[PDB]
Amino acid sequence: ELPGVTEEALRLKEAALEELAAQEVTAPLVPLAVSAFLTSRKKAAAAELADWMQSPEGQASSLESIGRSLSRRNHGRSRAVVLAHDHDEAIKGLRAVAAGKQAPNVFSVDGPVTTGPVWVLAGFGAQHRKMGKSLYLRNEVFAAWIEKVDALVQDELGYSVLELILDDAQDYGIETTQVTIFAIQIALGELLRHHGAKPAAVIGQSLGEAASAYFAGGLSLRDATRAICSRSHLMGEGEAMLFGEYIRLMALVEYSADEIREVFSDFPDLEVCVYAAPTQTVIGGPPEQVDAILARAEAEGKFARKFATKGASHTSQMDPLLGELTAELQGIKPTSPTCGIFSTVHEGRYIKPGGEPIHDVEYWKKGLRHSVYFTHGIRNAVDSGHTTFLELAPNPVALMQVALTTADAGLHDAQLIPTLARKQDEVSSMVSTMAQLYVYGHDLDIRTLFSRASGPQDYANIPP
């Protein structure tokens, strides 16, 4: 069996709840689904619902009850959702649906998207101090999955990730950034699955690869936790011992793989960490050469930025860790994927549902050591009909890279769906995420966005 929740986590939980229970209540974000076989019929339903919502009877009915009723309707070809906090938002929203006009809190589409979603598991550079905390405190399903990863990581590494999440005083490091994002990635995916969602395919990026292997059915939750724990601690301990001449930095710079081929001939020890976008690459190596490429970008008008690490993931530097990584991962049982995988480790190539297991000890070693072919994997997805990309992350930084690839590939209207972001209400964010998934017609039981009704007052007399 597994360690329980630590007494300290409980202590921090009690105090967090104390704090939460004392903030001014913010009105919840409610999704309003409006659906029909034809778009014209959808637009008239929209207009009807709006009219009724303007009437005293409609004005007396809670947004939540309107939503629950709307959610129980039959959901057809042409869909819309209005995301609202209050009646006025709601009406303004529904008018736009009716008028075929655009709005930030509105999504409206003529029919389903024809291919399933790609779940993007990245993480690199997305951490922030409070990530996952608010959703942990407010969502029992999410909480449950966090606590399961917390239990398994306590077992693996001897500390509590949940403590970090709950404690505003702690920030994240090389090691704890990785396992905590991972917990959050696992819990988000399973929250989503709880509401009916499923990935058609996954794509990993750097530290996200362990989560993607779990959601692809490539490894058990325990074995995926091993992969992330083995690597993050080795990496943190290695990077902590680095000073002066051994230090290797990481930076994002606005050069393509092709520009980098030429540019690198001035910088013999630079390596490519992540091909992020067609025009963006994360490079790594000696500070003086990293500093030099940065200043050459600056002088050419190109963007660049350093990552906070004394160590360069995805290079030859990582060679001393591989011995121990190998040994720590003995026993992991790679399994046949239950969904498609764009493997950024394996150069962006696609592995089929039912295919051969890829997630063996050497995959983890290859992934840590070598370049991450993210953009190539994304292009491969797009070229095969995928248009929905949903990022499971505390902050949707990879999705922005995804966007650059889709556009470059000519897909100017992809479905780019974030989850959590810093400075956005986390409960709201997930409602929004599941509403988007509904609209585009991917798997998602919208009824589950509402608690089972306790009485007639939990429904609304919306027009037929």
Partner: peptide, 10 residues
């Protein structure tokens, strides 16, 4: 890119 209060890459 500014991903806004509703999950939209603006």
């Amino acid at each position: 890119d500014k991903e806004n209060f509703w999950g939209m890459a603006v």
